[PDB]
Design a protein around this ligand. Structure first.
Ligand code: ATP
Ligand code: ATP
Ligand code: ATP
Ligand code: ATP
Ligand code: NA
Ligand code: NA
Lengths: 215, 215, 216, 215
């Protein structure tokens, strides 16, 4: 797998550093000279080039990369013209960072394989923690079911799993407990619930909220 | 709970729209006139003000908000001076959006309760999907254990749960199956695994990778 | 002693010229090309570099300097990020030029050994001379005692030291008299006070003001 | 005494706040709207005006002020044109903040009563403390004699005044000792010298340096 990242920003630079850490060949492309020099050591190859030019894009050997990431989310003209050239160049996978709803629709028309909203997806996840301080991190399996890593309160201290009727009343399944750095996968009845540690639970979205308010 | 969001960007504007959707009193503060007019309908109160000024900050009644979110991640001078005033004004919870590693350290010194890297955290999560196309969304319970929502391949088609020795060999637990829009929580042996649907699994980080390569 | 001065402004450039005059090894760092060329002859080593970058800061050998002066007082982002790198690099002495009260508090949190307000300290000293024209230069020993270099008026002309009851009534001690270029340290009774020359006095802050209004 | 300060900068704003604290009528003049609003409460009268215009300068009643301070030290054209109008308007006392050596000479030609270099005078005083850490604050009585407020070292601990032969050998007079917040004016023999407190001394410039190195 050969990866090309166009645009070394906060989002683009994180992909280059993470993929290079895992041991992948990453091409870092940016129009700014200072950005390329900073990420020269964090990428296999770093080039100062303009992605809106077809002649400069063909000089990079961009046709040899299966995955090309266009991490430009503040210049719609630069982002949409870059993916038009890549779609014309028959790139199998083009992942684009969008800015707003209208930028999402333009990329969908010109053939974006995946469109990413980094700030919008984090803003929704952060606001869920702001509304309810009991949650720490959640993953939406569907629109009605999710896995929520809850935080143990004072009333749940010194309580066994069998004492909590999550399975019968709330219809939720306890998944894991992070006992002060110790992690137990699929706890068996019964385990004592300690102080403010991570409590992983699984259930319906409305059913978990009932457990937070009541249990 | 009263929330104040300073800076209506891509990350700041997502928090205002999400918290207002859930039914919370949100104060939207931005120095740009066009940003405030766009988010006037998506916030309880929208004010055009400079957060670096103490006189303007006290005119907003900012001492009445438990949670203040400083979503400025491109101006270090504006972000650090804003949180210094809020820390001096005894705000119980200050959440700041950072830019880089050095911006993270300055906010930690001047008393930031939580520091958020929206683009950096998404860039790591996106790069995990780029490296392995089988994964769709994952949550890190710890540094060695995670819950990964996998994608079913062709070799797993028409296969029962008892056929897959994830519990014995790989030491991983199957959590949920998204059967073409139908979601089954904690499947019982045995369930037939269909085509390319979401397969939620739980196990050690190295153990899940063995299941992806072999199973 | 090796000194590094970051930012060649009106305040930063004065430190480079004064330390080089006394015979010290001074490193002059500035982001502006014209500033470095002007102070190239007034510093041991002058480099065009950005102090907010760790890679550029390590290329200067900045870990070999005991005293680093960050004389940036108009860019808070550049000033605070520079001192964060120096504090991370274990610089024994970091002296920072601040802009306002809020800039002073940020530098105190991130570990500034000394914070300097050049314009604010001069503005207070100048305003003391504006309010009272009799004073010329003063040093605050404490919040209630100071040494004030006064200016002799017409009523103090042809007056002896013993005639002035500064020691008994005002409780102030006359320290030195600059008699037209001639300086007398610790004058003995009695010395004739001439025309408008420098009269150094020492006493309580409220006691000196009584001498200016009544005696002077 | 009526004071007018033209230019509300770091140096100009300090004069307005100090003179208003002492109870003087201060006129604050600045071309920037935000500067005038900030110093409106710290001055008797604050006006947004351009000092280079004679019509605007006469609208302030500037002929009624004995002392006018032109605290502009980054715009030579604005600083020199302002003092030309004031000299033409017969202001008894004009104090100007200069920028460099060439700005000092222009103001001297066009009739500046006093020219001030705030950053240059502080830079010399700071560099004296940088070269010798024993000094704290000094005042130059002349080019060869000065009063230096020294810092007591470890070798001067538990030492009497009569033990130190400053009067005979070094020819210097000890003026005051700040004994941990207690200040003694003109100490009499003998007083014990404690740890790192302020030691005020008076003598020749070369004679004090000998005391620092030897005594
Ligand atoms: N035409 C272009 N070709 C290559 N790189 C470009 C081009 N235009 C912009 N870039 C670079 O892409 C990077 C990211 O762009 P930009 O800062 O506009 O987006 P962003 O949405 O603010 O980014 P992030 O949120 O990741 O910080 C920058 O380093 C910029 O220099
Ligand atoms: N001092 C300030 N007070 C209030 N709002 C400000 C201030 N400075 C900037 N803003 C606003 O905050 C918002 C976010 O800041 P900015 O665009 O600089 O950061 P960013 O990290 O690029 O944003 P994003 O959330 O889009 O990633 C912008 O709408 C900007 O106008
Ligand atoms: N990041 C930086 N690294 C090094 N030098 C810098 C940096 N940013 C600015 N400088 C330089 O530092 C010098 C002083 O900064 P600046 O002029 O902004 O402050 P100031 O308070 O107006 O200065 P002064 O009152 O001493 O004239 C300038 O010559 C400027 O070019
Ligand atoms: N023509 C003018 N009339 C009145 N005020 C002016 C004029 N031009 C500039 N000013 C103001 O004078 C003030 C000081 O000027 P400036 O900031 O350029 O000088 P400086 O030497 O850098 O300042 P500082 O006193 O902070 O060292 C500023 O607030 C500026 O807006
Ligand atoms: Na962004
Ligand atoms: Na200045």
């Amino acid at each position: 797998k050969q990866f090309a990242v166009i645009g070394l920003g906060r989002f683009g630079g994180s992909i280059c550093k993470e993929l290079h850490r895992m041991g992948h060949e990453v091409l870092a492309v940016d129009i700014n000279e200072e950005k390329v020099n900073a990420y020269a050591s964090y990428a296999t190859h770093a080039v100062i080039a303009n992605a809106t030019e077809e002649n400069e894009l063909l000089s990079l050997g961009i046709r040899n990369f299966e995955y090309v990431i266009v991490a430009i989310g503040a210049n719609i003209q630069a982002s949409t013209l870059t993916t038009l050239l890549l779609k014309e160049l028959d790139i199998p996978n083009i992942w684009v960072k969008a800015q707003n709803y209208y930028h999402h629709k333009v990329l969908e028309k010109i053939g974006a394989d995946r469109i990413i909203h980094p700030e919008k997806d984090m803003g929704v996840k952060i606001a869920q923690s702001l509304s309810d301080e009991n949650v720490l991190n959640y993953i939406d399996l569907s629109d009605e079911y999710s896995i929520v890593e809850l935080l143990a309160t004072r009333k749940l201290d010194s309580k066994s799993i069998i004492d909590l009727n999550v399975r019968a009343k709330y219809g939720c399944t306890i998944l894991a407990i992070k006992h002060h750095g110790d992690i137990c996968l699929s706890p068996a009845p019964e385990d004592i619930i300690r102080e403010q540690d991570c409590l992983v639970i699984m259930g319906h979205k409305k059913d978990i909220k009932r457990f937070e308010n009541e249990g």
